Write a protein that binds this DNA or RNA. Structure first.
Ligand code: NA
Length: 1272
RNA sequence: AAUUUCUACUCUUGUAGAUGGAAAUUAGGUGCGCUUGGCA
DNA sequence: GCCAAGCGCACCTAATTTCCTAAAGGACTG
DNA sequence: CAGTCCTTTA
């Protein structure tokens, strides 16, 4: 029998804590004298300079290995097809194995174990890959297999006797060449990223060529016109064998540029690619265009190779290199425009247009729509005015063919200025005159305005952009005129225009060159890693490593301290601190005794020793180890062969038992290995004294992971011993010990409130109850940072005299300027009405914005592990949760939904579907986070347009979501409920933050001993790995599809069954109305009733029969109803593209226009069909579509309600405008309600099942039939 | 309007909630400029 | 003005991998 | 030569 408090201590969770370090005594002084911080940055900067140089070895070697790859991808394609064909778990595992096989085939080119290459070439790669992740990179040996310059050689020697600084970097480069299913790797990018894209490209290609064969020669011309793949036809680049030549970045770039085309410098025609050719063919809007548009018509570009440098054949602008370079160069080009008098020449040309012949001044067709939008009401007016005047001068019977010829002519021909004026009216000339002088005056007012001295201030950046906008505005104006000699251009005008047009041409690149520099991020100060010339600083906390790592911890009178022991005179000298009797003044110094993962440390210290492996290469006799063993440990060939099988799975692993299938052999090898580890642990110096009597006999462990999950907690112990006070002050004065105080806001002197959750982890780690039984472990590989300084009366409360209501942001800064007596104008009306109810604080001490960044500070990052008694990973976590849910049928459900007018909307229901609580999370704690987020995004968009600093919105999102995470888990724990989400910005981040919080949930008000306390965290969600590897369920979290959660009637489950893309023409609309049985007027109730059988109109439905065989759709009588607050609204009102529609009144109007008698309950449909009015039937169909549109919304009105078109078995038509709290209050509440109900389906189907496995996915038909069977 | 850091704060030289760091890679987005076209 | 398919640039955002180590191994020093 | 200490490991 399970309980809710049983979901604790199920798997380990690792977190990192951050603190500030406060130097003590002479600590800060000795560091400045030894130059540690100075050389820590220099070594940091040498790393950043050397990293790209070292990457040349990886990039070159990886690129060289990928050039010889030749594989047959036919098997991989068949596994992809079979998984898309049948969605069974057998085809998934077949594809996963097939991908792993191909990843290893690529990996064998790196390590040199592929049968495709000869032994001489195959062995040469192994000699490189061996020393590819250690100090052999710096020998130049690997580069000798593939010449260093003096500065590079000087950079290599900067890490002499210090190559451990690249320790984590070595792991990042193993992630590049790894064969595992990790996205950081090259084999994964080839097999699972680019090939499915390339395989899809081949299918898109052949489908287009078969339907439109003319597209074949057209694609071939694009390939020949660019010059890519000259030795390969267009059909072969869309065949599988060519993908072997698409494994390097240069080939991937050429492949992507065949799809995307090539751009020259700005302002010139671009080389089109395959996707642009298809896009233009569709925009012709002919019969062929509709066929191409029906098929897939966009090839997918391949992803880049890992670590590779992207190449492009397009033009890259020259980058301005300094601040004054843009001022000196622009002012030089700016002062050149005065001497040439290009403004006076331009002002004279546009003044010529008042008297010269305008029938020879031509406007470009590529600019006609832009000019129409800049001088007239819309882009349409000019093209339409020319259309009407040209139709006005056609000859004879103006057919519709002659009109289409006039339309097509206006798309691709230059119009003379006279025909535009004669067709648009005199008001265009006034618009042309006003716009021309407006642009000319701004350019004239900008050439004489001097540039600033520097670009330091934003006000100086603005005037540079303002003058460039005026220059680009004149450059834009000149491009209005046609340049092609196909038109009869004026002799003098075309020569003078082309002259000043080419003299304004460099201004376009100056705009882009200036923006590419002025919008660059300013230099900011960043924290950097400290080492104190110790390559393994704070690597581990063990007592055997205190001299090597030079880091220990103290706790004195509730305060925590970090001690650093630097090298004295370039030599290590472990200043042995002497434990002393208690009560003597000093610090409780921690003694950290730890033996790491036994799965690797025991083989490392015994069975994998070089002497053991070498001995068993020749001899079969046992070998006895004596070094670091209190008694000799025996290694037999039977034991050595178990951990060195030469078969991929070791015989004591579950993989061997699951692959082979012999339980007699598996349980024998498992028992013989556990007995060997017990023999090791009893004799090894680090573990011989550890009492392991709690471990059960070896033959009782079912698998090895279960044994290691019980052994590792016994290999870690922490204890404290008092140290002499006088001994540390000596070690601090001499400089042999640097002492800091591990500090945060909860250790300030004035601190008196609740602690931060991270500090409860910290104090709980060192609580005496945790030292006896370890729940939280202190982990190694900590880091120290040093970030320099970054930045450089009366105060006002944000809330009123009552603490609940806040001052609006528009009135806060105005009141703060007033109480400080620095407001330079009259105080506004409402701000003066809020004056008496305002709370003012007197500045008793300076409170400085961003105080941490104004001074230099040290920082300390240390990782910990919670739930240390549990295993590293859980086993059957979802099945453990589902076992609880079957024993707790009344577990409520919390449905979280992403709304259209709400960031997050939640709805809590009980086990039977009744709503218990519904709320929008746009605002929480009386703060509108939606408006703040939306106003922040507007500011960031305007910042990019104004070349200002953009800023950060991710810090505002996390702060909002944290308040959301707090509110959701409270509802989760109070209700012991299940959270349901949508299956796929603000919502994606909320999902991860919710899983992480429930992976290791600690409530700061619970006592440490209780479930939920710091020593017994809650674990409600499955262990997070990645989003791709996650399924439908993660513990108490569930994911359901979003379709049919909003536009669904919460009283019946009804949805709109028809797809309106198929009801397109008159004959289809007539057959659609013939599928309905009757439509008549109810005299008593006053509304219309439309009866529809679900088995009719099958060609117009979405294929979802649901559960009801028929439905009574009603045209609700447009009465005036009132909600629970007395606010009026019209029943049946619909909002369509917006306008308000009243269908029942619009229907009565239609029937009276046709004289159709309906007040006798007569069936109306046969009368409309027999009369066969084209306009009346199309209106009748539109009315039905409006009635079936439940979700009616208009942003300006604030409306977003659900109004059901069907009446339930209880005679009610649901309308969220009644504001009944028992039911959804709007459309977003209706989504969250039905999301929780989709999760209820999963829990309802779990109890009827005999297994503990949830059903994967919810089909729309199973959901509609389920929810309709319930409500009817 | 102070913070390991973030958000919201101020009866309190601080309060409430949250907080996996670092390294590495990749993908996407926003804005601007430009090219060819579409806007029934 | 909007939109489509692209290209160049500026910066912002997030997903996914690794480690969270004492001790063996061995190159260098005195 | 063996101690020291950075490098590399399971
Ligand atoms: Na607090």
């Amino acid at each position: 029998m399970t309980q809710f408090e049983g979901f604790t201590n199920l798997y380990q969770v690792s977190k990192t804590l951050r603190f500030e370090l406060i130097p003590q005594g002479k600590t800060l002084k000795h560091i400045q004298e030894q130059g540690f911080i100075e050389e820590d940055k220099a070594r940091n900067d040498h790393y950043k300079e050397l990293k790209p140089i070292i990457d040349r070895i990886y990039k070159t070697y990886a690129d060289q290995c990928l050039q010889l790859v030749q594989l047959d991808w036919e098997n991989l394609s068949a596994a992809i097809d079979s998984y898309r064909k049948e969605k069974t778990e057998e085809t998934r595992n077949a594809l996963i194995e097939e991908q792993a096989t191909y990843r290893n085939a690529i990996h064998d080119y790196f390590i040199g174990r592929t049968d495709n290459l000869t032994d001489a070439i195959n062995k040469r790669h192994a000699e490189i890959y061996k020393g590819l992740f250690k100090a052999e990179l710096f020998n130049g040996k690997v580069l000798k297999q593939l010449t260093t310059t003096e500065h590079e050689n000087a950079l290599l020697r900067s890490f002499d006797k210090f190559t451990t600084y690249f320790s984590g970097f070595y792991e990042n480069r193993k992630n590049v060449f790894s064969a595992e299913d990790i996205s950081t790797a090259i084999p994964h990018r080839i097999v699972q990223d680019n090939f499915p894209k390339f395989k899809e490209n081949c299918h898109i290609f052949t489908r287009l060529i078969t339907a439109v064969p003319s597209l074949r020669e057209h694609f071939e011309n694009v390939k020949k016109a660019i010059g890519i793949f000259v030795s390969t036809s267009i059909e072969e680049v869309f065949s599988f064998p060519f993908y072997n030549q698409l494994l390097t970045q240069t080939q991937i770039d050429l492949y992507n540029q065949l799809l995307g085309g090539i751009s020259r410098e700005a302002g010139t025609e671009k080389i089109k690619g395959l996707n642009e050719v298809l896009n233009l063919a569709i925009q012709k809007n002919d019969e062929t265009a509709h066929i191409i548009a029906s098929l897939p018509h966009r090839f997918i570009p391949l992803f880049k190779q890992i670590l590779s440098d992207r190449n492009t054949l397009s033009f890259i602008l020259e980058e301005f290199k300094s601040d004054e370079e843009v001022i000196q160069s622009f002012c030089k080009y700016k002062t050149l425009l005065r001497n040439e008098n290009v403004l006076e020449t331009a002002e004279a040309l546009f003044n010529e247009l008042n008297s010269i012949d305008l029938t020879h001044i031509f406007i470009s067709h590529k600019k006609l729509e832009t000019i129409s939008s800049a001088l007239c009401d819309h882009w349409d007016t000019l093209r339409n005015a020319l259309y009407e005047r040209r139709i006005s001068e056609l000859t004879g019977k103006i057919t519709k063919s002659a009109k289409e010829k006039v339309q097509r002519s206006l798309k691709h021909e230059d119009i003379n200025l006279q025909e535009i004026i004669s067709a648009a009216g005199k008001e265009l000339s006034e618009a042309f005159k006003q716009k021309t002088s407006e642009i000319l005056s701004h350019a004239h007012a900008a050439l004489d305005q001097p540039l600033p001295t520097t670009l330091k201030k934003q006000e100086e950046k603005e005037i540079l952009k303002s003058q460039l906008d005026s220059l680009l505005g004149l450059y834009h104006l000149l491009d209005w005129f046609a340049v092609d000699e196909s038109n009869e251009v004026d002799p003098e005008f075309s020569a003078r225009l082309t002259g000043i047009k080419l003299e304004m041409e460099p201004s376009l690149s100056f705009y882009n060159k200036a923006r590419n520099y002025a919008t660059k991020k300013p230099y900011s100060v960043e924290k950097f890693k400290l080492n104190f010339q110790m390559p393994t600083l704070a690597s581990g906390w063990d007592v055997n490593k205190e001299k090597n790592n030079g880091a220990i911890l103290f706790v004195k009178n509730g305060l925590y301290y970090l001690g650093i022991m630097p090298k004295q005179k370039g030599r290590y000298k472990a200043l042995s601190f002497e434990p002393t009797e208690k009560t003597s003044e000093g610090f409780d110094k921690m003694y950290y005794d730890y033996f790491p993962d036994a799965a690797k440390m025991i083989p490392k210290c015994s069975t994998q020793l070089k002497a053991v492996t070498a001995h068993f290469q020749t001899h079969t006799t046992p070998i006895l180890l004596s070094n670091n063993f209190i008694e000799p440990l025996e290694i037999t060939k039977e034991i050595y062969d178990l951990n060195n099988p030469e078969k991929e799975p070791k015989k004591f692993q579950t993989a061997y038992a699951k692959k082979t299938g012999d339980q007699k052999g598996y349980r024998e090898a498992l028992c013989k290995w556990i007995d060997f580890t017990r023999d090791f642990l009893s004799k090894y110096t680090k573990t011989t004294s550890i009492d392991l009597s709690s471990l059960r006999p070896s033959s009782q462990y079912k698998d090895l992971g279960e044994y290691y999950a019980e052994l590792n907690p016994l290999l870690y112990h922490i204890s404290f011993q008092r140290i002499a006070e006088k001994e540390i002050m000596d070690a601090v004065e001499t400089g042999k010990l640097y002492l800091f105080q591990i500090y945060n806001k909860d250790f300030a002197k004035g601190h008196h409130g609740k602690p931060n959750l991270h500090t409860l982890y910290w104090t709980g780690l060192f609580s005496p109850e945790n030292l006896a039984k370890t729940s939280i472990k202190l982990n190694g590989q900590a880091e120290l940072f040093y970030r320099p300084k970054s930045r450089m009366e009366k105060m006002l409360n944000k809330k009123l005299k009552d603490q609940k209501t806040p001052i609006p942001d528009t009135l806060y800064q105005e009141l703060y300027d007033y109480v400080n007596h620095r407001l330079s104008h009259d105080l506004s009306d409402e701000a003066r009405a809020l004056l008496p109810n305002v709370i003012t604080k007197e500045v008793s001490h300076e409170i400085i914005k961003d105080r941490r960044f104004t001074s230099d500070k040290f920082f300390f990052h240390v990782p910990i592990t919670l739930n240390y008694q549990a295993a590293n990973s859980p086993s059957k976590f979802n099945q453990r949760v589902n076992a609880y849910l079957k024993e707790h049928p009344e577990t409520p459900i919390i449905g979280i939904d992403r709304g259209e007018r709400n960031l997050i909307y939640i709805t809590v229901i009980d086990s039977t579907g009744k709503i218990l609580e519904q709320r929008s999370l746009n605002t929480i704690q009386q703060f509108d986070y939606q408006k703040k987020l939306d106003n922040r995004e507007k500011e960031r968009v305007a910042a990019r347009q104004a070349w200002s600093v953009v800023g950060t919105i991710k810090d505002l999102k996390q702060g909002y979501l944290s308040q959301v995470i707090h509110e959701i888990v409270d509802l989760m724990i109070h209700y012991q409920a299940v959270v349901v989400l949508e299956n796929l910005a603000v919502y994606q981040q909320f999902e991860k933050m919710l899983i992480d919080k429930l992976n290791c949930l600690v409530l700061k008000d619970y006592p440490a001993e209780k479930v939920g306390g710091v020593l017994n965290p809650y674990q409600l969600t499955d262990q997070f790995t990645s989003f791709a590897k996650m399924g439908t369920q993660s513990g108490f979290l569930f994911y359901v599809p979003a379709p049919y959660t909003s536009k669904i009637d919460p009283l019946t489950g009804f949805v709109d069954p028809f797809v309106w893309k198929t009801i397109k023409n008159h004959e289809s609309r007539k057959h659609f109305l013939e599928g309905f049985d009757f439509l008549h007027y109810d005299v008593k109730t006053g509304d219309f009733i439309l009866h529809f059988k679900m088995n009719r109109n099958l060609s117009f439905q979405r294929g979802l029969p649901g559960f009801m065989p028929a439905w009574d759709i009603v045209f609700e009588k447009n009465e005036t109803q009132f909600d629970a607050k007395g606010t009026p609204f019209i029943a049946g009102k619909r909002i369509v593209p917006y306008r308000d529609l009243y269908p029942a009144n619009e229907l009565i109007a239609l029937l009276e226009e046709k004289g159709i008698v309906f007040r006798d309950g007569s069936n109306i449909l046969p009368k409309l069909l027999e009369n066969d009015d084209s306009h009346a039937i199309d209106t009748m169909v539109a009315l039905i579509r409006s009635v079936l549109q439940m979700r009616n919304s208009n942003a300006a009105t604030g409306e977003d309600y659900i109004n059901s078109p069907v009446r339930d078995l209880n005679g009610v038509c649901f309308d969220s405008r009644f504001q009944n709290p028992e039911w959804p209050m709007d459309a977003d509440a209706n989504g969250a309600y039905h999301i929780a109900l989709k999760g209820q389906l999963l829990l309802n189907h779990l109890k009827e099942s005999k297994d503990l496995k949830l059903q994967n996915g919810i089909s729309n038909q199973d959901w509609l039939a389920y929810i309709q069977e319930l409500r009817n």
